[PDB]
């Protein structure tokens, strides 16, 4: 219904759909495609773009940066996020130490050709760095105006709660967002644990992989298509998931869901993406796309949203059989 929404309880307003740059930018797709993909997302009102130092060893950032600079879009109209954790081969080039958060963000910001990102994320938790150091560094880079806000990714509730608690202890800035995985086959965290953090400390969920890497598109029904992600060099891990006992158990479930899709008169991907947004707990879904067809289709998930009755939902829940007890 509402295309824009507060990221958690922060005053930051995001389109309910964002465009990511994992696998694709500076990697799988060309820069021409990337530009086209961004221009499309932007012209349809998407203001949220997610990247990371790790993606294509910085190249995703270079490309995203170039597009922004080429199109001459007003910075105030964009919400750019980047994630920090893996920034190089040297020992001190990874993690959430003050040294890496600073050096990492600075390197990212340079590649992006931006003075700041809107949200900077801890890309995963760091058992080797005290919370206090991490929260201080995040608070430092915001105060340096290198970020507007900060967020966590793949942290547990306790980890997020701890970060928040430490911020209140030392009068620092709490995180506003957790970037968590969410699709029909990965629900536990976003559906049980995150809403409690949202109500308690106002942290919002910005979710990733709504098509579970393309799996939910159904395209893997008969195996590994050429030019699919599972087919790419260095995605054997995914190919293995897809062709596993559990991977197949899933594709069987897709066939049933496909029935529900044709009934609402939409594609399966649209249903799945729309399914992720079905609850106000989720602030935005980060899309992935290797072409303009995939993206324009995915944007269509929004039209599906009011078609998701509580009965269509209970129906999907039955076929999936993976609704987590709260």
């Amino acid at each position: 219904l509402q295309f824009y929404r507060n990221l958690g309880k922060s005053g930051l307003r995001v389109s309910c759909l964002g465009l990511g740059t994992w696998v694709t930018f500076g990697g799988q797709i060309t820069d021409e495609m990337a530009e086209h993909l961004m221009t499309l997302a932007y012209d349809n009102g998407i203001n949220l773009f997610d990247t990371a130092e790790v993606y294509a060893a910085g190249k995703a950032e270079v490309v995203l940066g170039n597009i922004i600079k080429k199109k001459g879009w007003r910075r105030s109209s964009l919400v750019i996020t980047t994630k920090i954790f893996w920034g190089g081969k040297a020992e001190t080039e990874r993690g959430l130490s003050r040294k890496h958060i600073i050096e990492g963000l600075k390197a990212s910001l340079e590649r992006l050709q931006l003075e700041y990102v809107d949200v900077v994320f801890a890309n995963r938790p760091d058992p080797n760095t005290p919370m206090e150091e991490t929260v201080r560094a995040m608070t430092h880079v915001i105060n340096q105006g290198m970020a507007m806000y900060w967020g966590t990714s793949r942290w547990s509730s306790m980890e997020i709660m701890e970060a928040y608690s430490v911020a209140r202890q030392f009068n620092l800035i709490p995180p506003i967002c957790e970037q968590a995985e969410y699709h029909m086959f990965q629900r536990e965290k976003v559906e049980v644990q995150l809403p409690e953090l949202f109500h308690k400390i106002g942290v919002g969920a910005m979710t990733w992989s709504p098509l579970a890497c393309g799996i939910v598109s159904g395209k893997y029904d008969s195996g590994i298509p050429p030019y699919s992600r599972a087919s790419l060099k260095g995605y054997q891990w995914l190919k293995d998931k897809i062709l596993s006992e559990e991977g197949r158990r899933q594709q069987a479930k897709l066939k049933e869901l496909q029935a529900i899709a044709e009934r609402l008169g939409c594609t399966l991907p649209q249903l799945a993406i729309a399914w992720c947004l079905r609850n106000e707990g989720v602030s935005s879904v980060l899309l992935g796309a290797s072409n303009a067809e995939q993206l324009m289709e995915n944007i269509g998930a929004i039209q599906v949203l009011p078609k998701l009755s509580s009965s269509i939902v209970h129906e999907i829940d039955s076929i999936l059989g993976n609704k987590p007890y709260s």
């Binding site: 306790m158 701890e162 209140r168 409690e196 308690k200």
Partner: protein
């Protein structure tokens, strides 16, 4: 061990989260129940209530179930607090009988419910 700040009308109490998890049906033991009193700005639970009582309420959890009315807190007041904090009817009756109040020198079902001949 994660810790909890409970603020009873400005009087700050601190305990561990597991100390409270020891009685999950009580208000403070139940996340959904206490969620309503949480102050995100201060990272504490605020209760606009009786200060002298809470001392014992928190010690109940720490002691693993001892519930004694502080000698300086009236009976009617302290009882209301036990009721609010939802300590439970078991803990409540143990307090009732420890406080010095006996209602059942009884056989449980005889005196009250009795006779099967409606007549």
């Amino acid at each position: 061990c994660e810790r909890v700040v409970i603020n009873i009308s400005g009087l700050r109490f601190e305990t561990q989260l597991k100390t409270l998890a020891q009685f999950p049906e009580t208000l403070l033991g139940d996340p959904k129940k206490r969620m309503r009193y949480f102050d995100p700005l201060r990272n504490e639970y605020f209760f606009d209530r009786n200060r002298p009582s809470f001392d014992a309420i928190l010690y109940y959890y720490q002691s693993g179930g001892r519930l004694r009315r502080p000698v300086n807190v009236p009976l009617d007041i302290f009882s209301e607090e036990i009721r609010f904090y939802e300590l439970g009817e078991e803990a409540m009756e143990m307090f009732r009988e420890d406080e010095g109040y006996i209602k059942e020198e009884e056989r449980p079902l005889p005196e009250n419910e009795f006779q099967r001949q409606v007549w």
